[PDB]
Amino acid sequence: MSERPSDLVVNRLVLFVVKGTATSTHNTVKPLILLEELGVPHDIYVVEKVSAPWFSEINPHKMVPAILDRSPDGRDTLRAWESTSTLMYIADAYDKDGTFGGRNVQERSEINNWLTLHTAALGPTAKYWLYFYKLHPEKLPKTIEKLRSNITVQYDILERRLNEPGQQYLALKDRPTIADIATLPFAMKSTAELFGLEFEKWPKLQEWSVRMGEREAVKRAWQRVAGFGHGEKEYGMLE
Amino acid sequence: ERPSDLVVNRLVLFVVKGTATSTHNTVKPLILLEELGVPHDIYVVEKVSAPWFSEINPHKMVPAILDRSPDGRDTLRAWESTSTLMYIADAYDKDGTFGGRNVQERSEINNWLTLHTAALGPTAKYWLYFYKLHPEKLPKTIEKLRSNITVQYDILERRLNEPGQQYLALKDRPTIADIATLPFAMKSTAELFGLEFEKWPKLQEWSVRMGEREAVKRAWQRVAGFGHGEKEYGMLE
Question: Which parts pass through the membrane (chain B) (predicted)?
Fold first, then answer.
């Protein structure tokens, strides 16, 4: 059994993050964007060690983002982990008019298609590219090349979708959804440059990334996620 | 242009001809259709490269779904196997038997469903690609992906060792999380990866318990047979 830190209390949604760095924020920013869009009251908890027993009992995958929140009746606690799952949870609990989660079966059908495309395809492909490029002890260039090639195929799919008449966002024509929030961090100029790709080659995808990036909630989320653990408090429950 | 026999009068599940290597994803929505008793048609796609099919699924893979909107005035689509499970649950499981009855249940279902969608699913797909499909053999990449499969099996094993945790998401019953995970966490698939499945005893017990379900038995029987009957390609009778 594991013991939690004394400052870990769940009086509202608690979003678990690590110290902001270039390589630590592309997943944690996703739930933070949706919390900012919906004005959900939330705490930020900066995790010193994701290998800590107490944290593994929240997220067995031992990564951020993770969420602890009160159950709707406030009697119990529940958890969300995997960035896509944190988006699903926040939409379920707090998006009660379906603005970001989808208002009907038809809207949700397209939202889940484009959300799952990111969760299963671009997300893991980008993660494996990053691993084999930086993290793996040995350099495997033929593997890195194939993964880079797969990223361009995913960008091609997103570009095709955003070239469809009146298709301003990935899932819905009219407004951004959790599908757009999930995709943005892996389909923007800075991330494309990291992969060694010229993002200008996908012009509608670039225009979409700029339109998403101009949203106040998105600007706020990016600013905050970079700063977590670099304020008055380094680790634990932020004030 | 769509084939003349592509009629969307109810849910249409797009599959390919049943083989040992073609059914691990298409079986997922088929299990849930069988569990819920959803009326549905089966469409055996000859070429997923066909332009008409890319207008349904731009990722050009099975499974995919076309169905009528709830009011019957429009058609909608689902693609990515996880998305097909989410759609069927949304449209046909209003009691949340497989989709979750409340926020608490749905939180755990989405955790374990997303874990499969993001981790074991894509890792298994990349392992299979480099093992059989890539022009060159990269054994160091294959070994790392094989290693990552054992790490996912370890996470699933630890979950199924928690008190009363008979299924991945919920203690009491299987959900779309269990259906998504099963094809990549059973003895036959473990043997394909070159792993001894007995090393994960609670995960193995879980795979057998899921396998004993009548809906799961029916899904495996049917998905193997698609395209081997009186009609090879197109809408089955």
Answer: none
